[PDB]
Paper text:
The two 5-fold Fabs differ in their binding behavior. Furthermore, the VL chains of both Fabs interact with the AAV9 capsid in approximately the same region. The 5-fold binding Fabs in this study bind offset from the symmetry axis. For the 5-fold binding Fabs, the contacted aa are more spread out and are located in VR-I, -II, -VII, the HI-loop, and VR-IX. The adjacent VR-II-loops not bound by the Fab adopt the canonical loop conformation of the AAV9 capsid in absence of the Fab.
Author numbering:
A (entry chain l): 23 to 129
B (entry chain D), E (entry chain C): 219 to 434, 478 to 580, 594 to 736
C (entry chain H): 20 to 144
D (entry chain G): 430 to 480
F (entry chain B): 219 to 416
């Protein structure tokens, strides 16, 4: 199981860093992709295969991957932009993995 | 011959005869089912036109292809020592291939438990392209090569190719190959396969360093790479990797010149500085796939060739400085070195012209290199309905295959004649005690090559 | 000395399955079969069937052919019966005994029995 | 086909490239971060032939 | 040939012909999967012993290996009687080894069950080192012999080997062999494997006890041994078990002298004393591994040589006493006695020089002793994921493979020529009743050997 | 030859030629696995004195043996009736033994139901002591004969033998015969076995 910190503090008009620390068998081999989860609704694909993003995703997201860690940069945090954000990677033969998940705090 | 009868015999050997060598390494392969038996277009969507260089249009296929194209498949780190210390030059003669003990497993599901059962009567297609009609993807030093350590089962890489594009769209001059459309041999669980190939006549490799320098006929071509320092403090405090890059535009897409025409990686006495893209790079064992630190990768310094070749970080000369020089009557130069981990050959593309075809990454050039080998499973459809439905069958049994693969390559050598009174520079191990023998498995069992190994040791006159 | 040990008791409500364990201590444990005799109150002994230790394959009884399942393990040296569908009817003290041949090919009898086991089955919590 | 694109789009090269010379804006931030060259970013891959 | 047709037949016999014998033996065998298909590295630390004496380094490999090195495998306690009583000595000539009826079972593990089913197509690799390239483990008198009693079914031992070490760390000279780099044969369920051997000419083993003592030239060399008494009140009440023992020392690590050059056990008539490290002490059947007490171990004695070789608890003489003595000219001695449970051969190490190479524990020392036979299961890879990953496959199907094994050796004999008038000592069973037959299975079903058997019974004039 | 093609044919017949007769018989036999593949010592001591004359000592090997030693394995009650009425004397001359169509099974039990399944490759050992080196137990009129009625699938008896003893304890002049010690042909589902004797 990957590890990412539980909370991210924020203020309107900041960017928040969100980080996921993998291993040589997890993030080392394959990319991470970051999901938004807004409890009650379907998880949403924010960042996949590192920097590239899905057509709908706002410009304000940038993910970045280090050798063993994944970092998520959210430009322009907003009140409505808060949601529990998850790490996900492909480890093993092909099973998907998920970091514990982290709930942003917009204030 | 039968299910019960073994179709071949494991051969791994090194036989040393006179001026020639023989290397056969048999390894174990595993082939999954790619794309659920569908040729599929791929295309690079990425941004809204921000990144233009990264555009590609091509097809993905079911066929997996055997890529043995890297040296360390064929030579054992002992032999590579044996081979490099004693022999000025070498080159392959005869290729041979035997693919046997094909087993088609039939992974299934049994009410919550996966089941890898036998399917005897399923078949395995295979064929060689001896006419080079297909794209040739062994040319870019791709991954999926046979495991360096004999005892590690590997997995066959997927095959796919690219064609002409304006942006992500295709163009009327494009070509869609279908690999089914070749005559192919269907190997069922008992049969085996083989073919033989004669390497076209190539110039010997040069494993040696000039005992003499050309200043003491003008040094070879140069195209300058920006100079990077392995100490981070010395480097400029800005992100210049893309900007620094030495590029060549083809069709309005700037591609980074890599690895670049053969030149010395650094000047004598300046080991740390290295060309940005001139040198080839390898990973260490289990090195991360993005943005890893310097000591996580191996950076091969070309220095051996410096005498004859212009340095890769310095301008050529004066007239104003000369940044890039081509060919002048009376130039001589040395090739780019080859590595235990570095490729063997490349396919000389089909052109009205070429110059000194020897491929840039090192190794040997050929017009008709050793053929490709494509192996896919044969689709087995799940029970189709009773009432005939013209749509094609989209539901197949899951299978995969496993077996052996063997390759026998006859190498030729060019013996050492030297009169040099003082003793050479030999490769050698270090004696100083350590926790792991180099090129040997650790406690976990992972097999790791600690250092790349270049082939220039001996010395010949200039 | 040759000994056979059932585990402690459980209390499981109808529809629950309960496995039982029998530890064979003090003998080869693969050369002798193990029979499971059951006694429900006011009923005679009843034979749930035997397992062949080394074999792993069991021979069940006519009445219990459906519900009873038998599994074993040489490493922990114990054998298991699993009664998948408990009922009020299936309330009994379970025994594991071994065939013992008394050093003769000709004779067969259950010489060693375990101390005991009792299953209290009733829906009432 | 076309010269720079002969590669197989589905697989990484074992060769690398230098992706980052910096961590991020500031003083004394220089660093060397090597990355694998593969289907996503193809213009940094090692090529055997030039026009 | 095929699945249903048996490959080779059970041969177990002794054929007594003139001056020469033939003992064939067969056994059944199962081969697990060792080290999860991984060459691994092992030190004292991975084992956990922190001493310098017990420090070691080396690898431990999947491959299994057969060991018939022990007498009790080929000879049945009948013969080893008929073999010793009637003969003045022997030696081997030709050993023939076969291996047939391979079967491969693939264990499947469910939530609570694991069902065994045949994987017909699966294979088994086997080869023999006939050039003596690998390290040779058969000379350490390891466990894992073919069992003595044919109906037993024996598990094949793993193959691992020690290399040079400093502490737990290697040195650059410490080398690592990868067995897969040796050519081997691959056997599906129908194939068999057989070869033959020729024992290089060695001295006959001497089976006899000199009737006439040397002093009725000079006795042979001597290296003293601390005398330990099976009457435990007589022994000094101190912890002299380790400190007392004589120990030949190498590279700064003291190794116990086991057993040491052949010497008599004790002075004639005192049977309760024995060399502390001098004589082999076989474990009785049913004996545990550790800290056992006296009666659970049989103890050999060398009494038959008390004529020539000096007592191992005595000094060789005086000049002041002499505790150790090397070879003088004109010495005579006799080697240690081979036992029914003891080894047969060992390999004379490869050196520039040695003296009287015949090993200490008994048997026939050889510079080309019978090759080892290594075996493993060619791993079937479990289903790969549909998209390539450069890694080696870490998930396999759990298997083991079983079959038969049979070995035929030809022993040569030397007849008894003596004109002695009165009768000999002969080895025999003791008629007197007992709850069990010696050398035979008890009620429980476990085969036990009550006593060792020496080979020295008949007498020769000195 | 192979797995799918039979290894023999079914002959039960009797053919009366002049002064001699040929009586052939063919039955089915199931051989279980006795004594978990373990030779073991047998003796009855049920009392420290045990029984005076009923005490015995010996072993009980896993091998099974074939008893055809009875007349009604070779004769159909008619052929017997034909034999006794018309003849003064008779005697055997030659015996031919053919053993074919081996079929091996594997008893695996999963989830409470045990299911038999062909194990193709597993083998069956057989031999004929032609030097009469083993104890001869066919002479004691034991049960386990081939069945009198061809349609009866029968089960194969176990071979064990006795030796010298005093009380229930053996004496050195006893001997323990391993049957594994003889050479014996191995058979898979395709092989047969045959031999003749005068």
């Amino acid at each position: 199981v990957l590890t990412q910190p539980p909370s991210a503090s924020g203020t309107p008009g900041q960017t928040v860093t969100i980080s996921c620390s993998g291993s040589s068998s997890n993030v080392g081999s394959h990319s991470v992709n970051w999901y938004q989860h807004l409890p009650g609704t379907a998880p949403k694909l924010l960042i996949y295969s590192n920097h590239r993003r899905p057509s709908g995703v706002p410009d304000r997201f940038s993910g970045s991957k280090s050798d063993t860690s994944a970092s998520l940069a959210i430009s322009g945090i907003q009140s409505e932009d808060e949601a529990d954000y998850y790490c996900a990677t492909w480890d093993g033969r092909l099973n998907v993995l998920f970091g514990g998940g982290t709930k942003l705090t917009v204030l | 011959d039968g299910v019960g009868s073994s179709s071949g015999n494991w051969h791994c050997d090194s036989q040393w005869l006179g001026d020639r060598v023989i290397t056969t390494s048999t390894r174990t392969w595993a082939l999954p089912t790619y794309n659920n038996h569908l040729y599929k277009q791929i295309s690079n969507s990425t941004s809204g036109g921000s990144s233009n260089d990264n555009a590609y249009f091509g097809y993905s296929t079911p066929w997996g292809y055997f890529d043995f194209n890297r040296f360390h498949c064929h030579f054992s780190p002992r032999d590579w020592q044996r081979l490099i210390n004693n022999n000025w030059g070498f080159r392959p003669k005869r290729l041979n291939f035997k693919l046997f003990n094909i087993q088609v497993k039939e992974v299934t599901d049994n009410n919550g438990v996966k089941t890898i059962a036998n399917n005897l009567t399923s078949t395995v297609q295979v064929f060689t392209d001896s006419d080079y009609q297909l794209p040739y993807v062994l040319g870019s030093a791709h991954e999926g090569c046979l495991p360096p350590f004999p005892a590690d089962v590997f997995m066959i890489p997927q095959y796919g190719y690219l064609t002409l594009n304006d942006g992500s769209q295709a163009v009327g001059r494009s070509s869609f190959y279908c690999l089914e459309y070749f005559p192919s041999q269907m190997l069922r669980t008992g049969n085996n396969f083989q073919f033989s190939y004669e390497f076209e006549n190539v110039p010997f490799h040069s494993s040696y360093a000039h005992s003499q320098s050309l200043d003491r006929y003008i040094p070879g071509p140069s195209y300058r790479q920006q100079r990077v320092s392995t100490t981070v403090t010395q480097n400029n405090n800005s992100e210049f990797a893309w900007p620094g890059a030495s590029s060549w535009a083809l069709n309005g897409r700037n591609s980074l010149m890599n690895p670049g025409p053969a030149m010395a990686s650094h000047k004598e006495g300046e080991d740390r500085f290295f060309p940005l893209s001139g040198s080839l790079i390898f990973g260490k064992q289990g090195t991360g796939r993005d943005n890893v630190d310097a000591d996580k990768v191996m950076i091969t310094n070309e220095e051996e060739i410096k005498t004859t070749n212009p340095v890769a970080t310095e301008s050529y000369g004066q007239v104003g400085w000369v940044q890039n020089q081509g060919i002048l009557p009376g130039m001589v130069w040395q090739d780019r070195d080859v590595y235990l981990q570095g490729p063997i050959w490349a396919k000389i593309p089909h052109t009205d012209g070429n110059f000194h075809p020897s491929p840039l990454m090192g190794g040997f050039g050929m017009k008709h290199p050793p053929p490709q080998i494509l192996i896919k499973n044969t689709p087995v459809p799940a029970d189709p309905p009773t009432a005939f439905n013209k749509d094609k069958l989209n539901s197949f049994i899951t299978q995969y295959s496993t077996g052996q693969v063997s390759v026998e390559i006859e190498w030729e050598l060019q013996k050492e004649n030297s009169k040099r009174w003082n003793p050479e520079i030999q490769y050698t191990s270090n004696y100083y005690k350590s926790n792991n023998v180099e090129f040997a498995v650790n406690t976990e069992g992972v097999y790791s090559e600690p250092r790349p190994i270049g082939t220039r040791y001996l010395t010949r006159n200039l | 000395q040759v000994q056979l040990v059932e585990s402690g008791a459980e209390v499981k409500q109808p529809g629950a399955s309960v496995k039982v364990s029998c530890k064979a201590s003090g003998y080869i444990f693969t050369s002798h079969n193990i029979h499971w005799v059951r006694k429900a109150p006011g009923q005679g002994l009843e034979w749930m069937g035997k397992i062949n230790p080394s074999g792993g394959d069991a021979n069940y009884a006519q009445k219990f052919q459906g519900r009873v399942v038998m599994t074993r393990d040489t490493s922990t040296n114990t054998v298991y019966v699993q009664l998948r569908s408990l009922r009020f009817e299936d309330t009994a003290v379970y025994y594991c005994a071994r065939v013992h041949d008394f050093w003769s090919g000709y004779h067969r009898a259950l010489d060693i029995w375990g101390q005991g086991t009792m299953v209290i089955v009733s829906s009432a919590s | 086909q076309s010269l720079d694109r002969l590669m197989n789009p589905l697989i990484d090269q074992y060769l690398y490239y230098l992706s980052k010379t910096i961590n991020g804006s500031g003083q004394n931030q220089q660093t060397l971060k090597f990355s694998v060259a593969g289907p996503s970013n193809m213009a940094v891959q090692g090529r055997n032939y030039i026009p």
